[model samples]
Target: KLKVVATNSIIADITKNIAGDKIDLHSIVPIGQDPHEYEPLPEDVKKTSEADLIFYNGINLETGGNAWFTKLVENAKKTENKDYFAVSDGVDVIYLEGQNEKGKEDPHAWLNLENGIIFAKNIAKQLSAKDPNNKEFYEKNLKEYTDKLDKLDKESKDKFNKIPAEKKLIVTSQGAFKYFSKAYGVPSAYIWEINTEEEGTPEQIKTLVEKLRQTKVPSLFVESSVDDRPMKTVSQDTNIPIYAQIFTDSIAEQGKEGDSYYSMMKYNLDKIAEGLAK
Candidate 1:
């Protein structure tokens, strides 16, 4: 079995869907942790050194302005594209519209189910290349998994379609859903671009408050991997309740509601629809 090391729990779930029991997989970051601000531990280094393949979301998803995984590969005395794979390599990337890092690709592409299918394909491709004996098995699992992704995307769209046009707004603690918003025809606002930056600045809060007051958006939300204080403050000031904490950046902890990739996306879709419903 290939010893696979994934960067985070979400990526691990994606890998498990395709690899099944064919590989021994471990995720570097624990569940419900912020991958953007995560620091690799000593044990993580040891594991990276021993792994047959390492899978990570590229485009700076590992850390803000830091290629932590690239350095970890070096620490393992391995080369990228050889021993490691970037699952996000071929997805259509979106950038922050007006933030300081405008035109920089937002690394949370997996939030969009279409891109997520691409991630699964990329993973299957690498795994097939590594273990040709299981090539058919990997491709078969990839097709089965992507079929579910397509179904999830359709179901999500069906639910979103029922929401009134004016109600299609998503406000969260971080700008982690630009791709999601684009995918579902919803608009989103957030306190910060990514969790790696200093969050909840006075200017950020004030700006969001102003927009909220002007738009009178019905509800807001907080992400599982980020602090909810700033968003709670906005909720208190605006008097609009935060509907629910959605999963992004990371999946739920073991035995939890959003533990798997499909369940996580389903939970978010249901919650967002509940929040946006007329």
Candidate 2:
């Protein structure tokens, strides 16, 4: 049995969908944690030491280009592209402006359903290359999962298309939705570029207040992984209601509304429509 490690829950969930019971899969980062700031424990290092293969979301998904994953790989004496791989290797990536990692492509590509397909394809390719005996099995899973992703993408587009064009603005505490917004034709405004204590400041709220006033965005949102205090403050300032909290960096915990990728996508789409379509 191949011992597979994924960097975060989002990656791990996708890995589970693809690999199923074929591999013993472990995720380095737990659910509901900020992937950017996740610190690996000694036990996690021990887990990494046992990994036969690893998959991570590249393009700086984790802070400073996955420092935790890097340290684990170094400690394990594993080489990139041989013992591990980035599932986002060939996806068309979007770059963020004035980001901490300047010109760094936004690491949340999986939010884009099309890019999610790319993620599945890359995972399938690497798993096939690493375990040639199960190539057909992995390929079969990839096709099934990609078909589901395609359906979700279409349903998302169709749902968002119902909202008035002028109301299709997404305001949030962080700019994590660039891919989602771009994919669904909703432009976004955020208090901070990404979620962090250093980045979350009064000035961000001050600036966003003016933008919300100018744009007259209908509603604001909070993310599951970050504090809602900033967004609540924004609502108080702008008199715009906090419509709903959405899952971004992580899937909902087990048995919640967005326990799976497909359910999360559907939930976000439903909430966005409810908030903006009015």
List TM-score per model, in order.
0.93, 0.94
Candidate 1, superposed: residue stretches over 4 Å from native: 98-103
Q: Per-residue lDDT of 1-278 in model 2, one digit per residue for the tens?
A: 88888888888888888888999888887888878778898878887888888888878776364467677788899888888898888876778774455437788888888988898899899888888889999999999999999998898799888777877898877898888888899998888885355655888888998888876568778887777888888899889999999988788789988887777877887788788876
Residue 199, candidate 1: alpha-carbon lDDT: 85
Model 1, 29-112: lDDT tens digits are 888776766778998999899998889988778734566776788879977799988898888777656444523778889888
Kindly report which residue pairs in candidate 2 clash with one another.
Answer: none
Residue 267 error, candidate 1, Å:
0.5
Which candidate number would show the highest lDDT if scored against the true structure? 1
Model 1: which residue pairs collide? Answer: none
